[PDB]
Design a binder for these strands. Structure first.
Ligand SMILES: [Zn+2]
Ligand SMILES: [Zn+2]
Ligand SMILES: [Zn+2]
Ligand SMILES: [Zn+2]
Lengths: 386, 396, 396, 385
DNA sequence: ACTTACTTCGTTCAATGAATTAAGTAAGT
DNA sequence: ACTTACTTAATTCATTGAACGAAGTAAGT
């Protein structure tokens, strides 16, 4: 990523994208609020807003109440300038959503398919629905495709390095969709990252710039947001906190290591510990509340493991806030008090800074909205790099 | 941390700082090569270079070999445009260095003084030493002061929130030094971040853009660099991997928690475990629990010191394996006075840490040791000032 | 010296100073009358008036009676936005005044002190007095210091080149005072120019734009105003009509020349001619040669005093006739100490001076006396600051 | 009244200022304009475009390269228009058609006894003005400038009185305006017109301050301070020639007794002569030949002129005095005496010397000066209304 | 002759900030 | 229903200063 040369195009783009983003955030806003918050004289907004309206990305809104005074006319973000299609690839099915530029779902469908070991066919099935959801619309307005998957992703290339869930290896997902949509960006990322984009744009991100998102289900996912940016490692390759070692020589994990955190702090623990003594999360939780000794032990220890996992996310990253999301299970059923009891005693609370641990305020559609946000985030990012 | 308004001042800064940096990294370069690398027409570069030469930060170099073609004149970075003073605060001494703008040490000195619970005294002594390090030079050429410290730092306010090692609490370091030097920037950061900065500019960073820096010795420090940027959490507050819990209900750490990685993967382990092992190995020759002493007794064959040293290596290995799984840093660079005894732990670290999530998927993470000497801690502190002064000021 | 560049800062100043002066001139006026007079739309005036009110130099006044008609609100000049200190330097005393922005005297005092050949002592005493004159007020509201002096002045540099009456030679008055008050303008001008400013702002200037001001007393001073501007010659150096030669090879004057008008048309003449007459009138009751004493004995019927007074009135008349023929001032205002005994010379002045070039062509030049009192010299000095502060800054 | 502050005022200030620098130099590079007027080259892009669009400047020749694309000189169009100047004398009416530099293109003299025939004189002016433009487009005529001997009301353009011509209350401008309603017409005294010539073509090329003193049949004085001529109330000029130097002295034509010009001008010869040929040239020559009466007249006129000039220096502080002969050769005056007397003054006594010298200009300057009445108005920065 | 390197002169365009138009409210007769 | 007096919203245009383009010189192979 090299910084763009300093010139007039860079000046125009910076001011138009910044003003545009404030308008997105508010939905509607007066020229005067934009001026105060972005430090622009009204005459500069004359040219910026004129260009944006000419593109069709903003619209004239309603007249505001008079305070003197000529009545101001609201500047409205055109959420329908275009649309996005998002896809979520699951074991049993392919979920789809056509969304507006606010990531609000307009249409959604589900196509059942056995995606395990047949990526070629899954891609073609994706390409088909993408074309079908735009069947009663103009495909010029299709601004991109966003894909959420469970696995390891090379974001530099848009390839799925590995997906244990689906039995995929080195699938050039983006390359294959690009043959069907050459002018349309196609982005793939892991589920936890798509969900985190949903929190950033629709959830916790509306009041915080820093938080960590922890998904607990069949595995444990972690995505850290610092200053409204998600942390990725080298070459854009995401870190894998779920596969940190907590017990040397412990349960054999599907990643090839022994003793991974997610083998103790996720639903996998029930499967593992179960065999050593039904183990689906919801049944185990019910049985626990009913006082079954085995079910209470599993829920209790998973809660302890999760607690130490979350404490270490806090100590390692200094996220300020941790959001727990259930992935295929209801997080309110977790031993939340234990998790909080353990993780709230950390390095930073010891020094006078509390870190709040809470649960998501978003619903299931957020996974798909997040996948769409992969595209929207890219479209509205101030283009200072090349 | 917000983007500046798009205007002529912004683009003027983007271009002149980008050109300046290109000249600075190459030491010497021609106008044609700058123009080609930066996509400028010659007239554009002409004006940018005039401003820089008039400031005195670049100088005319010698001519180069012909390629056609008139002989192009090199443009040279004036490494002596100004100078920097760096400081490293330790329990029993204060270290000082005066560097050029490439962070090369021109002078350095150290003094005995106990800063333990004596912040006003230490700070007054540091101010006098900054003045003395300038010697006969022009004070107007002092570009800043950079300070490496062991503790918890608020980089925004320049305050040391806490340093358990020094017994300091809520010390307005930057502000107190601004009372003596009002017209110059003064920055403070953790020791590990200073060293990483030195690594970024003078070591591993010259050839790679991603790496984790792990200091082993009297403690355990971690800093991660991704795409030439050091990771910091919320509000610019550093992460604290050394204070991750590896053993619930384990050794009490100076941070208030129990079972921190630092209590098992550093010198602290020898004192914690040593107390427990004394009666189990009565014949042992270990008189002291400092790193160098434990290394000598283990390398001599003492059963207790080999257990202590080998166990510390194991815990360190698992710590590094978890650095890899968590951050995906591409490479891990081990650092610190603990390397003086690398022969005793590097093999165990490599055995444990080479098996990780990423190696399971076909990506090997190199684990190596630093190629920088001990002065890098001081150079790193100097680079706090240099990094900040040469950074393209895109943010306001 | 030259006109400012045409840009937004210039037009901003032209408009806000023009509106400010309109308000200041009228004391209180409405937005509508300003807009009417200055040809502005109401929105334009709204912004100009916001700036002025925010600075605190105009205030919101009371409502005006309806014209049919929402009630228009008066805009008032804040005469107390700041204050000014003025000084008058005499041989035997230093006079001080503190004035509001209408040049109205709030306070004034005087002190005995011999400034003769003692500029440094006098200037130190003036500086301590400026400080004391401020009293309980905020020094930040002292807009300046204006000084009236008898002598030759370089107004650019603020230096007294020469003052024969004080024995001062190349005294950097303004620079020496700037040592005490660096952020405050300090102006110096001759007594006659100070009084003329007072006349321009508080007296004759309220009704007319052209007049010559002539001071009679212990000297003769002239200042000419045409189109509300005081005439100055080359480099801003004042003209010196009092030092015109009326009698070749005549009385030696303090300026180095012989026969100057001032040696015949002022008190100086009583001393020069008095010396030559003593023996021709031994019986005469006239002891002293000061103005009032000569007037007393002449009004009592003394042959010597009547001759001295009659002649000086005659020479004064010819001096004024030539002021008229030379400048075409439209009006001549007589001023000074000497007015106390106007009954003895005003008739002769009128007889001689009313017959002039312009009266011969049908244009009569009115010759009158000032309607201002003694404090006008101090007010004039204060007006050096006020004039300069409220002047539309079109030059630089 | 100052003009309101707005964009038109901004435009005019910068265009007129840049235009004036170009007139001063004849030709100049855009870079010198930029450095002299503190403008960025891009601001000049628009200023020079507007001025070229008007046809008041032209593209000049290229300049020697210094690196370096060659700069193209920006040239003042002295022929954008022309001016007609008139000088009203006792025996004749002189005329000149000049370019915008006041350089004489065409000139003529129309013999006429203007004494007591004002309407007629004005009709000859209007006709010759109309004829001077016989071979040139009339809309290029930018104004008419008239130099006259006498008293002038400049607010109205009327000749209040001219003793030379026996005119009284003649509405010169009003009468010419009937023939040239779109053309400005300016009237002023000869001395003021000559001073404009000095200011643009002579002493004004090296000085911002000077007094011009004409010595002929009468004594004229015009004072320039900071490149502006001093006028009295309502623009009515002062009359230093009619200051009293001798109470009950020679009866002057202004109605006063003892005026300076009755002693320090050629009138002194006529006056003193009768009390004992008195034309200046004959008296000067007779004096050089040792005639006792002629030497006395020349000696005393010199002393009187000397005291007159000393008092101009003392009154006005002009920095320098320029002596001009009007109908006579100034070099024939007792210049050393004038200098001896006048150089001892108030200001030289205080360390500031005042140079007294003679004009470097020739006779056509009177007419060039009258044309400059119009030119000075056209090129003045319109900051007022 | 060709190439490469550097310079200086002069233009374009986005932002800026002053007046100014656009379109109301505010409060009387 | 008028009339006059204020307010706030949003636009125009001359200047500005950054890159950029025009059109040369400079000094080699
Ligand atoms: Zn695993
Ligand atoms: Zn700890
Ligand atoms: Zn004198
Ligand atoms: Zn006369």
């Amino acid at each position: 990523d090299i910084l763009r040369k300093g010139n007039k195009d860079l000046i125009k783009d910076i001011n138009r994208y910044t003003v545009l983003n404030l308008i997105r955030e508010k939905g509607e806003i007066t020229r005067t609020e934009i001026a105060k918050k972005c430090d622009f004289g009204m005459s500069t907004l004359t040219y910026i807003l004129d260009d944006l309206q000419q593109e069709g990305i903003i619209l004239e809104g309603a007249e505001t109440s008079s305070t003197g005074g000529r009545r101001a006319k609201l500047v409205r973000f055109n959420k329908d300038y275009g649309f996005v299609v998002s896809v979520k690839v699951e074991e049993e099915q392919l979920l789809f959503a056509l969304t507006d530029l606010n990531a609000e779902i307009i249409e959604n469908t589900s196509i059942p398919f056995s995606s395990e070991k047949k990526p070629e066919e899954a891609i073609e099935l994706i390409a088909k629905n993408v074309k079908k959801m735009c069947g009663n619309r103009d495909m010029n307005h299709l601004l991109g495709v966003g894909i959420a998957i469970s696995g390891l992703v090379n974001r530099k290339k848009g390839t799925v390095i590995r997906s244990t869930m689906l039995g995929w290896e080195n699938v050039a997902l983006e390359a294959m969709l690009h043959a069907h949509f050459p002018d349309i960006p196609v982005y793939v990322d892991k589920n936890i990252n798509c969900y985190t984009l949903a929190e950033l744009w629709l959830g916790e991100g509306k009041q915080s710039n820093n938080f960590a998102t922890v998904s607990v289900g069949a595995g444990l996912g972690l995505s850290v947001v610092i200053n409204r940016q998600i942390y990725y490692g080298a070459q854009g390759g995401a870190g894998e906190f779920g596969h940190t070692t907590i017990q040397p020589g412990g349960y054999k994990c599907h990643c090839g290591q022994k003793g991974c955190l997610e083998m103790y702090a996720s639903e996998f623990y029930f499967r593992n510990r179960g065999e050593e003594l039904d183990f689906h999360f919801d049944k185990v939780a019910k049985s626990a509340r009913a006082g079954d000794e085995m079910a209470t032990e599993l829920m209790g220890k998973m809660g302890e493991y999760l607690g130490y996992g979350i404490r270490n996310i806090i100590n390692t990253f200094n996220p300020e806030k941790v959001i727990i999301v259930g992935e295929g299970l209801h997080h309110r059923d977790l031993f939340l008090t234990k998790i909080d009891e353990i993780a709230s005693q950390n390095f930073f609370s010891g020094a006078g800074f509390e870190t709040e641990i809470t649960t998501t305020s978003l619903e299931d559609p957020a996974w798909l909205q997040g996948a769409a946000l992969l595209v929207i985030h890219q479209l509205f990012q101030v283009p200072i790099y090349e």
